[PDB]
Amino acid sequence: WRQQWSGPGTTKRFPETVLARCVKYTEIHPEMRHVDCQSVWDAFKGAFISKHPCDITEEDYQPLMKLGTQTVPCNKILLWSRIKDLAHQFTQVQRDMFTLEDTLLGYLADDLTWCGEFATSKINYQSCPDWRKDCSNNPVSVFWKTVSRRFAEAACDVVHVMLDGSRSKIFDKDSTFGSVEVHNLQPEKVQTLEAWVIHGGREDSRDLCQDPTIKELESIISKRNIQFSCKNIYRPDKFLQ
Numbered sequence: 001w002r003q004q005w006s007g008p009g010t011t012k013r014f015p016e017t018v019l020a021r022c023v024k025y026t027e028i029h030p031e032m033r034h035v036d037c038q039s040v041w042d043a044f045k046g047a048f049i050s051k052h053p054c055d056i057t058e059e060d061y062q063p064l065m066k067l068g069t070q071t072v073p074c075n076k077i078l079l080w081s082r083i084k085d086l087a088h089q090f091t092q093v094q095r096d097m098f099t100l101e102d103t104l105l106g107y108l109a110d111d112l113t114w115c116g117e118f119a120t121s122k123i124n125y126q127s128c129p130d131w132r133k134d135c136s137n138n139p140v141s142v143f144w145k146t147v148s149r150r151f152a153e154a155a156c157d158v159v160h161v162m163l164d165g166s167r168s169k170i171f172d173k174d175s176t177f178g179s180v181e182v183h184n185l186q187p188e189k190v191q192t193l194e195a196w197v198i199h200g201g202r203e204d205s206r207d208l209c210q211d212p213t214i215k216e217l218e219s220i221i222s223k224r225n226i227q228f229s230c231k232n233i234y235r236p237d238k239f240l241q
């Protein structure tokens with residue numbers, strides 16, 4: 001008998017890839033000289049190997065979180081939801097805004113899938129639990145839930161979030177931003193959450209800050225005692241310049 005999940009299995013060469021990304025990150029960032037990439041890999045593998053892939057906890061990732069500290073300035077955070085490429089293109093142009101992918105852990109795990117099995121050290125290259133179809137507490141989803149919660153908790157001053165105005169649901173309360181990040185912004189550190197609704201499609205222009213999902217985000221943020229601000233980015237290329 002072999003247990004089979006609905007999701008794709010661990011990315012081929014996952015151990016080598018994580019180790020190589022750790023080494024590349026330390027070679028490009030001077031503030032990472034004290035980081036031992038072999039220890040980072042051992043902490044990462046230790047979070048999920050030998051464990052049932054549907055019973056992973058935020059606590060399983062604590063050793064990895066201790067090795068992969070966050071150093072980005074809290075007043076320069078850009079969150080985003082379903083507009084990844086434009087958000088990262090904007091940060092490369094501003095050079096004074098950072099996303100979760102700018103951190104060691106965000107950079108290590110991006111676009112990778114991984115899981116193990118109970119009692120053995122074997123990484124499952126055949127299949128991994130799908131968050132929706134199999135189980136929410138899988139190694140990948142738990143990792144992103146933990147790292148995005150820490151990223152949001154650290155934020156301060158004005159936090160910006162880029163949203164895709166051409167989507168049917170502009171703010172989706174089920175996304176990582178909607179279900180994790182918004183709920184961990186601290187009012188004693190964060191004065192305002194400012195949404196930038198990008199009009200990056202050919203849709204008929206309209207004030208998208210009036211969309212029902214934006215009113216829902218405003219309500220969530222207001223109940224946390226944080227100010228909400230929303231801006232329409234009617235001309236994204238002009239906003240970049």
Ligand SMILES: COCCO[C@H]1CC[C@H](Nc2cc(=O)n(C)c3ccc(-c4cnn([C@@H]5O[C@H](COP(=O)(O)OP(=O)(O)OC[C@H]6O[C@@H](n7cnc8c(N)ncnc87)[C@H](O)[C@@H]6O)[C@@H](O)[C@H]5O)c4)cc23)CC1
Binds near residue numbers: 142148178179181
């Ligand atoms: C309270 O419990 C109940 C809720 O549970 C949480 C729900 C979220 C879940 N997130 C992910 C699950 C997981 O399996 N994978 C593999 C993840 C891969 C990466 C990240 C990711 C990276 N950056 N971020 C920070 O969050 C904001 C951006 O995320 P979003 O707003 O989600 O934007 P989206 O453009 O839609 O997605 C970003 C990517 O993630 C995938 N993803 C998203 N949601 C899921 C999901 N439920 N199941 C499977 N995959 C999911 C999606 O396919 C895309 O590749 C930014 O501000 C960043 O700082 C999060 C997240 C996930 C964790 C569990």
